[PDB]
Each structure stands twice: as C-alpha cells, then as structure tokens.
Amino acid sequence: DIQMTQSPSSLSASVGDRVTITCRASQSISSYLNWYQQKPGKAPKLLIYAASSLQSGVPSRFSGSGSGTDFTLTISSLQPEDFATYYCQQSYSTLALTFGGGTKVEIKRTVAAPSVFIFPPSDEQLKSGTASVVCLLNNFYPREAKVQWKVDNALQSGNSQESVTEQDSKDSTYSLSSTLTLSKADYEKHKVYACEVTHQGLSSPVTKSFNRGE
Amino acid sequence: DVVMTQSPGTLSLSPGERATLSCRASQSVPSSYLAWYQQKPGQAPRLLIYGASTRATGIPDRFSGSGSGTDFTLTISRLEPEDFAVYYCQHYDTSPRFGGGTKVDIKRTVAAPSVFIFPPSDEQLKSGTASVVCLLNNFYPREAKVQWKVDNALQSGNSQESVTEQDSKDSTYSLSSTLTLSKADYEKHKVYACEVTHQGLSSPVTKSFNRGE
Amino acid sequence: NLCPFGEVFNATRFASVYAWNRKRISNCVADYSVLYNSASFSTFKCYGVSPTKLNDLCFTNVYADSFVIRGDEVRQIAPGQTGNIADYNYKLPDDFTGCVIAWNSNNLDSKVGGNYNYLYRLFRKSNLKPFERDISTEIYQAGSTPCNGVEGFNCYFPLQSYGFQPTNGVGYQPYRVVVLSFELLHAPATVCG
Amino acid sequence: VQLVESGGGVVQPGRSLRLSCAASAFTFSSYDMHWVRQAPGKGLEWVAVISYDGSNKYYADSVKGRFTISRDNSKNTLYLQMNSLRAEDTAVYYCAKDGGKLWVYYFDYWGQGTLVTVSSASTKGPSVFPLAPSGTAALGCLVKDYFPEPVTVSWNSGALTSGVHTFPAVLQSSGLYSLSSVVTVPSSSLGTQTYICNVNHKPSNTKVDKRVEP
Amino acid sequence: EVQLVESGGGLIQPGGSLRLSCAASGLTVSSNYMSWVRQAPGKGLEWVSVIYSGGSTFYADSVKGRFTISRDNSKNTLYLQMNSLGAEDTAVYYCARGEGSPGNWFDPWGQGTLVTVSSASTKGPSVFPLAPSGTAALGCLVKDYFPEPVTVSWNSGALTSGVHTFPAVLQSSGLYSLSSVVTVPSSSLGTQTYICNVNHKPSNTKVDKKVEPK
Ligand SMILES: *[C@@H]1O[C@H](CO)[C@@H](O)[C@H](O)[C@H]1NC(C)=O
Ligand SMILES: [Cl-]
C-alpha cells in the first residue's frame, strides 16, 4: 500500500502569513495528488486536484505543486476561516485510495500561563463505588502541557485520561482536564491528592493539592 | 505464511537406535519447500536434507527425510555419538523460516568421573587472587555434586561450575569447579580439597593438596 | 467489433511467468464493463486510471499480459515492487498505467501429484527492464569457473518449478494474472471504450 | 450540489446496518460515487466506490467481503449495506461524488456524515456530578458513565456563555463515555449567583439539572 | 575450496553501529543470493537479510530500518551494516549463500562471528597454568576477559585428543572466565612440552602458556 506522510502534523500561523504543507508518497504517484480541507464537525472540501489544479469556487490563495513523491500545498495569505485540517490524498492507485495523516492549521497567539485547579471526588460519587479526581488547566498556550498525578508522592500513569478543548475563538487559548478514575475502596486510604503541571508559562512546576474533607 | 512446529524438544536415544524428528504445520506446505539443518555444538548449521527428502551432498545415508503436507519427518537410523546436535526444519513462505529445533541427546552407560585438583599458580597469587580448580572428567549422567572443603570446613558462595556439552565421541560430560579466594585468605589455610559424589562412585571421592607442599 | 478479452481471460492453459504471454489489442471497441463483472477476482488494482473511466478513454494499443504465479507473489505485480518475480520474471514500470487482475486457479492449475509445468526464473545476473521477457535456459554461472552449458557446482539451471498441489495453503496455490496496459502514443487511437 | 446522509445509529457487533445518501442538482446517473469513513479522532479512509450504472463495485481490503455498495439512479440515492460490523468500524461515514475531470478518482463534493458506533454496550444514561470550588474561582459538572455520543451541556439554560469550556468525551475502559464541562466565574459572586448545568442525552432521553454550590 | 570467512564481530555499545564482513572464496558474491542468519545465545536460528544478485534487498521485520546488507564485488565480500543496536541484537551472525528456498537453500555457511551489545569495556584475558601432579590432567585458566569469545588450542592444534574447553562463566565482577584442560599419559609429563594457545579475538590478545610440573 502507498503511504502518504504529511509534515508537519500541526502548525501555528497568524492571519496573512504564508503557509506551506508537505506531503510525501512512499512511491511515485506521478501527479495524482489531491488536497482537502475539513473543518471540525463538517465534511471535507476539495481544494487542489491533480497536484496543482484549483477546484471551482476555491479561493485563489490556495495553490498546489509537486510531482513524483514530494508535494506541497500553499496558502499565500492565511485567512481566519482557513483554520482547519488539511489532508493530502493520492489517486495513483485508484482502487486503493489513501490519505495522509493531515496537518492542522491553528492560531499562533502569545504564550499564556494555565490556571490549575484540583477537585475531590464528590460524596454522591463515593456512594456509587467509583471515585474520580479531576485536575483543570485553564486558558494556556501552547497546547503542549504535561499533567502528572502523584498519590502519596508516587507517580501515577494509566489511571487517568486527558482531554483538551479546541482553541478558543476569543483568546485562542486551550485547556486541559485529567480525570483520575478509581474506586471508593482506593480513596479514603489516603489524604493528600495533588496535581503537578509543567507548562511554558511557568518558571517552575505549579502543583495543586487538597486534603480530603478540609 | 505458515508456522511450523518441531517435536519433541529433546530426544534421548542410545547409539544404533532410530531417531524420529517431526516438523508439523497447520496448513499444508509443498514438500519442495522443506529443508533440514544440523548444528553441532560450537559449529555452524549444515544443510542435511532439502526438498523434504533429498539428501545433501556428502551427508551420510543414515539421515533421511520424508513426509508431505502437514507432517515432515527426519529419520536418523543407526544413531551415532557424533550425531549429537540440534536439528532445525526450515521453509520459505514470504521469508525464510526456521523451526525451534530438536535436540538429540545420546544415552550411554554410567561412567564415574576422574577427579583432579589444581592449585593456583604463583603467577596469579602475585596479582592478589587465588583460583583453585577442580576437574570432573568424562562422566555420565550429568548429575554430580562438588563440595569445596578448606581445612575440612565446607565452603559455599565462593565457587562457580561449568559443564561441557556431551562429548561427540564418548557421549560423556566434563565439569570444572573454580574456587575463588583472595591471596590473603588463601595463605591463611593449608588443606584445599574438593569432594565429588556421582552415580558411578560407590562412595564420595576427594582430591586434595597441601598449600606449599 | 468487440475486443477479444475473453481469449485472454478464458484461456484454458496459461503461460509460465518467465514466458508470460502478451496479446496486442487493436482496432476494436472494448467493453470493460462486462469484462470486469464476469468472474470473481481475488486481486483488482488499477494504477494511473480508474476501471470505470476506461469506457470513456481511447488508446493507440492495449496490451493484455497473462501468466501464473504463487499466491504469496501476487503482491509483486505492481509498480515499484521488488522480488524474484518483479526482478527476474515480470516487471512493471514505476509509472505504470493500467490494471492488475488475479484470481485463484487452484482447480485449473494444481494436480494431485503436483503440477510442475509452471516455472519461474530463479537465477539472473541483473533485473529485468519493465515489460521485458527472458525465455533463455542458459546455465547460470554463480562462481568463477564457467559452466559451458553443463549443470554442476555453482552452475544452476535458471528456471524452477512451482509444483502446484490442490491442498497447499493459498500462499502456495496458483493464481492466474492478467495485466492490462494502456499505451498512449501520438498516433491515431484504435481502441475506445 | 447537495448530498444528504441518513441511517446511522447504534449497532451491536456482528449485526447489520444500511446507510443512504441522496444526491441533488447534478446528473447522478453519470458519475461514480464513493464512501469514506473517519474514526473518532483519526483520519480519512476510503471505503468503497460504485460505477455510474452500478455494475462495477470496488471495496477497500478492510471492508471487502463485509460491506456492500449500491445505488438507485431513479431515486438519486446511494446505499452502503454494512454487515458483520466490528468495533473498528466505529466512524463517521461520508458519501462523496466523484470529480470526473481526471482519469483517476477524487472527491469534489461530500456529505455531512453520520456516526456509526459498534459496541456491545447498551444505550445507558449519564450520571451528572457537580464540581464545587475550594484571583477568581471555577466550578463545573462531570458527565460520567453514559453511552453513546453525544451529550449537550449548557449553563443556566443557555444564559452563561462566556468563560464556559466543554471538553470532548473520552471512552474509558468500561465502554462508556466520560465528559467534563467547567466555567470560570468571579470569586465575588459565589454565594449570591446560582449555577446549574443542563445536561441532555437524546439517545437515552435523559435531562439532568444539577446545582453547583461551594 | 569453498569458504565463507567472517569478521567484524565483538563488543559494541547500545545504540552504536557495527559492520560485519563475509569474505568468499569458491563462489561469486555478486552472482548469488547472499543471506545473513543470526542466533541469540541458547536460542534458535533467525534469518536477517538477503541481497539478490540483481541488487534487491530484503530484511526481517525485527531489523528493518536498522540493518543494511551490501557487497563489494572487487573484494568478493558480503557486508552487514548494523545500526541502533540493542540487547536483542546480541547474537552469533552467520552468512550463507542461498535463501532457504527450492533450488536456493542455505549452503554453504560461514563460521559465524559473535556480536555483544553491552555498556561494558573490552578487557583482555590473563592466562594461568593448571599444573599436573595412569593418566594425568593439565590445563590453562583464562581469567577476567570481556566480551566473549576466547578460543584455546593445545600445541598449535597438534594436541586435540582429550581436550575439554569449558563454557565461559560470568563472574560477579562482570568479566568472563573459562578453563581448558586435557588428559595425557603420566609418563610424557617430563619428555613432552604442553602449550595452550589462547586467542581473545575482540582484543586480538594471543597468549601462549607453557604448562609444566611444579
Ligand atoms: C469468458 O467466460 C465467461 C464465463 O466463463 C463469459 O461470461 C464471458 O463472456 C467470456 N468472455 C467473452 C469475451 O465472451
Ligand atoms: Cl568465551
């Protein structure tokens, strides 16, 4: 099968900037390379077909080029509505059409510090059997932030699952929620429940803890 | 893609007997894709049979391969001590595949070990270490107990053993036990002895030397 | 009149891959729809052209190559592949334009005692050019001493038998392959869909 | 050019499901039609293609001998019969009109897409728990143990808009989903202003209002 | 006079690279299928790579992207370039003409070379005599070397009957140690010279030790 490798997987650019996305093919696909734009929650839309041919109705700021194994999509002047994911899709092997992994184009704002908050599992949750400790990182940038769970100063990994909201339309900042799931029997045995956070807007890792019932 | 499985893991037969080694698969494999390889200890693999049943050049007649489909067999008639080795079946589907191998051990009559004890060299002693070596030579079966006594005091925790593979000619084993002391400890004691117990010995055998004598 | 694709697909006997057959198709109307919906195919992969678009296209000449290989080797009949078949028996170019079609032929090409009529080239000094055919049976020299057409050590017959047996696993079973090439020259086309 | 999908929903492993896609405003009986799916969070994967007349059908190896594509040109509708559904088939299925301006395949128009979730879990309703606060403050709600997607969360019946962050759901190891939703408010109006989160789960017909107080 | 003579083994640190050589006489490397087959200690045979006379190369999944097979026609020599080595790559590496397939079996084979992937250092051995007192026993103690292997012969190969060279044992210091012994008639102890020839290939340390009565 022909694998399409896109680079980078993500990029941050402001309006008016010139953006170029790379798409490589595991073998020569001649010129049968198509580009697509897909907005979160909407259908993909065709932008460039046959490496360089513009689709009817697609703005002139979009252009494609390349041949063989190296292809490029270019936005000469980025616009606010041009923030979506961009896939390349080879059509040389017509009965085995494959897509690249995609390149998400997002807003390049200034760096901002997260507001960390920790939450005990509720008394209504302990009555059911389970118990979840939630840690919140609020309004930061960039997305890259490390959340570490420490129970009695012991590193935890595999007991939680993170989640990130998309870039805010107002101030372009992200957020994070880490849900440390456990059972009621695994809860009252301890007292200190903390949450370590590493971010670009922190001169040193900030940590938030609570004592159960205090 | 076909996985082939050899059985048994180890085969123990007296010389002159007939050895049967199996290579089985879940799907049928054409016989022309089947090969067997012999690997003696320390040596490289040697092509024995190819095409399931065709003997390789210079291979003795007592090796023969047969079978088809899901059951390929290697037979070693008139088993010899030199036949001690691991045998692998082999085939190609999308890449060369080797079975896990079958080890052929050779039984023989009980043989008591000849025991020898060696003092450390003066050359090593000058370096600050003393190795005392006890040799158990040409015995069968492999089970043997070696005990170090220093001035009639049983030692534990300062010795290591090593055993050879079965000898390709007489099918016996040999074992070496190395007692390791510092020079200062070695000079504190006089009598160094290793005691050997083995099926071939009606009673334990002790070899000893007096340091300095 | 219609193009004779059935003389290729419905042939009773197929060529060995080393001596693959090629039918040159010209001056006829091609009905690709009925061709692709006839038998059931285990492999159908087209490169540089869509199967449904062929009815609209015209070509100077259309080539239909056919041969038999092992199931595990069908992946080698594709642009940009390497292996004993692609290197030494049948090679497609990196910019191939056409379709590769294959189906299991265990009922036709395997025998209870083994079918050894189908062969492939095992030894060759160098790789084939695209669409090259080599039917020589010259003794292959794998050492310094020449062979002089005599088999021996380092002197190998260049061809090897498949030996198809109907109970083999599908990787070892025979597959009939048809490769459709679409040659577009600056000459008046003779084959349209 | 319009393409409208329907027929998606919840299905158990090994069962069957049929999707439809009605075309409009173009010669439907002369173009090829495609099916393309996208797993949650993953990329695009071409599924199947059908000829203009419906005589030729071609499928991807991941669904061959398991899905079936068909079309009715008199009704201008495209179909996809999905039998023996495995958990990996959980994706959003799009129908795409083939472009037609090249010798090879490419997608110039897409349908909006419908969700297919393969899981032996049943349509279970959510359990909402509040998040009490302990230089502003924050409070939220926790939608845990529900199936399937999605769940709509608002604050004050749609009155509290700014400062709200609803996080994507995560499929925990219990097969059910867990979702977090928070909102930051000034620390002054905590005992005066009332905050109630509005959780709604249409697949299970569950509407829960929960008070959030420190 | 058909021979495959291997070289290039020894110690290499984790993540490092090494290049093995297979010098041929009796066959033309560039005219044959040439393979590498390896064997981890105490384990089975594993095919690693092949190079076709026509130039094509193939690799087992376990070494793909890390190993590179090649040949030098003017030197009639096969090569294996091994990169990013780890513990799983510690093995004896054999070369062979062929590829274990009909009309194309593994024959002949090279004598093999041992590759040891460790963080330790190369240390040459110290050789000490095991002096004798119907038949008598004498030997050589080869102590404190790394890595494996050492070989021992007696009287330059002229003495083979009754020779036992024990498998090396890993001392608690991290260095290896072994002994080679031989039994001889007691009468020849005074009228026959006995010399053990110790060869530690990783350091090219060759020691000859006369073993005399004391
Ligand atoms: C080839 O045979 C099939 C049935 O075996 C038949 O349907 C088809 O029409 C034949 N081909 C031609 C060109 O007639
Ligand atoms: Cl060694």
Numbering used by the authors:
A (entry chain L): 1 to 214
B (entry chain B): 1 to 213
C (entry chain E): 334 to 526
D (entry chain H): 2 to 135, 142 to 221
E (entry chain A): 1 to 133, 140 to 220
Give the exact sentences the study uses for this entry:
S1 is responsible for target cell engagement, while S2 completes membrane fusion, allowing the viral RNA access to the host cell cytoplasm, where viral replication can begin.
In the original virus, residue 417 makes a weak salt-bridge interaction with heavy-chain CDR3 residue E99. Mutation to either asparagine or threonine abolishes this, and there is little direct interaction, although there are weak (∼3.5 Å) contacts to heavy-chain Y52 and light-chain Y92.
